[PDB]
């Protein structure tokens, strides 16, 4: 890519991206909220 830049997939090309559908929003939010929940429980136990 250093020597032939135009022949390497560009950052705006669809070749190098994937797309999120309806269910993926819910999946990611569930992941993040569960992690925050467990973190808060750990912090409370440590403080107690």
């Amino acid at each position: 890519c250093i020597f032939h830049t135009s022949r390497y997939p560009d950052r705006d090309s669809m070749v190098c991206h994937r797309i999120l559908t309806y269910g993926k929003y819910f999946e990611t939010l569930a992941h993040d909220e569960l992690e925050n929940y467990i973190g808060n429980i750990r912090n409370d136990i440590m403080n107690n």
Partner: protein, 97 residues
């Protein structure tokens, strides 16, 4: 040709196999402060070099080196004047329509 230089002062688009060297040549830190003279002997069949290699440092030097090139061409048997060489015409390919 006289000494016209460049410094890190519009955008350019070179082939990137030449751009590396082109941008390397823009840094004054990559050049010696004084010329480094030749040390490996060559062109043993000529004494005009001794005339050119020292003393002559003006238009005479340019004239002498052009003479040397012409002498080499004459010995080889070539035109030695680039203006008198024929360039291939490509209009024969693209004259359709």
């Amino acid at each position: 040709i006289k000494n016209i230089g460049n410094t890190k002062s519009e955008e350019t688009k070179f082939e990137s196999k030449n751009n590396i060297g082109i941008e390397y040549s823009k840094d004054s830190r990559n050049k010696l402060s004084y010329r480094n003279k030749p040390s490996i002997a060559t062109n043993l069949e000529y004494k005009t070099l001794c005339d050119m290699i020292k003393g002559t440092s003006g238009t005479e030097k340019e004239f002498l080196r052009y003479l040397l090139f012409g002498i080499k061409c004459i010995k080889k048997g070539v035109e030695y004047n680039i203006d008198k060489i024929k360039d291939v015409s490509y209009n024969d390919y693209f004259n359709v329509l």
